Design a protein around this ligand. Structure first.
Ligand SMILES: Nc1nc2c(ncn2[C@@H]2O[C@H](COP(=O)(O)OP(=O)(O)O)[C@@H](O)[C@H]2O)c(=O)[nH]1
Ligand SMILES: [Mg+2]
Ligand SMILES: [Zn+2]
Length: 396
């Protein structure tokens, strides 16, 4: 198919223009769509078709060239991940780096550099090793030539030594759509579709689950991101942790098997789906089991080829600096503390039952399906709001 091939994360300090840039690239000026956004992770996908004008040779995301008017040729479909707040974004990168193939760091030319949030976003990208970065120097029309060049130097200084050191800095105006063609061109040159092994065991992280049968039948539907291999109609799949049940007054989870009846990607039904963008998986599952996002956070794969399920985790801990109302200093993790953990699209509270050298043991409220070595975002309830304090690496 012509489904999205890569997911591009939109990062940068609040108000610098991430959302406006996303809309400028996706062509959305109306409308909501936030009804397909994640619940465990407030993540949203917005596709755009990258095309090139045979005539003037400039890139754009319209079937009609904005510069000469001619019809453009299809090059590749991509998906942009844009989230509401700083926290949700940071958590998304640390919990699911496998969801991003590259990133566009938005930096507003009229703001003093660098800002706390921008610093934390780069830190997250540094931690997950995401180096396919493009920098968008936004709101360029709001500063004179001198300010503009000076801001550029600060950015170059700012990115030196980081995973963004080799990133191009592109002066643009997201709001007025200025110099956007250069940015689209950069997406093609700096965020190439990775060479994935379509033969690795399939793995999909479930974002949302529904019962699409109108009020007043088709099986349950799972919406998510394929991070490995591929899915095909007719495929038999296993879902973990699975369906919850009660045994001796306690909750347990039963992995469940089903079959793929349909696949929606890129805005249409297909026979095979791959990594990139959101994928809708129609199954033979009883809608009663997927209704109301009951399977959000679960992992999909082929029977006998899924990561293990954990009731508790031994985590190698790496606490964050954190510079973004005072309370910057992250206090050490104490036994008995209740933390909020995000791993992949799964989310669960955890009770610290043991402490070790740069390590904690945590009993989970809800089991999670993950592989040893996977990254887990750790949040602490500060007053009355969960705050990201670091991440852990699952150990055996
Ligand atoms: N003048 C100007 N304003 C812009 C530009 N891009 C975005 N904005 C505005 O600045 C504000 C913050 O933008 P928003 O897209 O919500 O960015 P976000 O907070 O990073 O996700 C909005 O009022 C936008 O209309 C630009 O190129 N020029
Ligand atoms: Mg925004
Ligand atoms: Zn053209």
């Amino acid at each position: 198919s012509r489904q999205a091939e890569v997911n591009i994360g939109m990062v940068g300090h609040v108000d610098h223009g991430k959302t406006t840039l996303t809309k400028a690239l996706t062509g959305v000026w109306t409308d909501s769509e936030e009804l397909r956004r994640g619940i465990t992770i407030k993540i949203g996908f917005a596709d755009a078709e990258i095309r090139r004008c045979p005539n003037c040779g400039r890139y754009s995301t319209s079937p009609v060239c904005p510069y000469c008017g001619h019809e453009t040729e299809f090059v590749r479909r991509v998906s942009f991940i844009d989230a509401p707040g700083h926290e949700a974004l940071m958590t998304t990168m640390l919990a699911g780096a496998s969801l991003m193939d590259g990133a566009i760091l938005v930096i507003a030319a009229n703001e003093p550099c660098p800002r706390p949030q921008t610093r934390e976003h780069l830190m997250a990208l540094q931690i997950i090793g995401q180096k396919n970065i493009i920098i968008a120097q936004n709101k360029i029309e709001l500063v004179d030539k001198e300010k503009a060049l000076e801001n550029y130097r600060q950015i170059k200084e700012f990115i030196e030594g980081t995973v963004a050191e080799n990133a191009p800095i592109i002066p643009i105006s997201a709001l007025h759509g200025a110099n956007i063609d250069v940015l689209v061109k950069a997406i093609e040159d700096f965020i190439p579709t990775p060479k994935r092994d379509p033969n690795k065991p399939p793995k999909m992280l479930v974002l949302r689950s529904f019962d699409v049968n109108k009020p007043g039948l088709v099986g349950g539907v799972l919406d998510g991101s394929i991070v490995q291999g591929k899915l095909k109609v007719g495929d038999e799949i296993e879902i973990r942790p699975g369906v919850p049940y009660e045994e001796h007054g306690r909750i347990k989870y039963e992995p469940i098997t089903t079959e793929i009846v349909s696949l929606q990607a890129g805005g249409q039904f297909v026979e095979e789906a791959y990594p990139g963008g959101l994928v809708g998986v129609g199954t033979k599952l009883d809608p009663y089991l997927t209704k109301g996002d009951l399977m959000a956070g679960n992992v999909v794969g082929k029977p006998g080829k899924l990561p293990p399920v954990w009731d508790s985790l031994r985590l190698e801990v790496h606490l964050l600096e954190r510079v973004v109302e005072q309370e910057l200093k992250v206090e050490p993790i104490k036994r008995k503390e209740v933390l909020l953990l995000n791993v992949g699209t799964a989310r669960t509270m955890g009770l610290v039952t043991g402490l070790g050298k740069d390590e904690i043991e945590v009993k989970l409220q809800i089991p999670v399906c993950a592989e040893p070595g996977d990254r887990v975002a750790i949040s602490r309830q500060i007053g009355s709001r969960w705050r990201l304090i670091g991440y852990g690496i699952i150990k055996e």
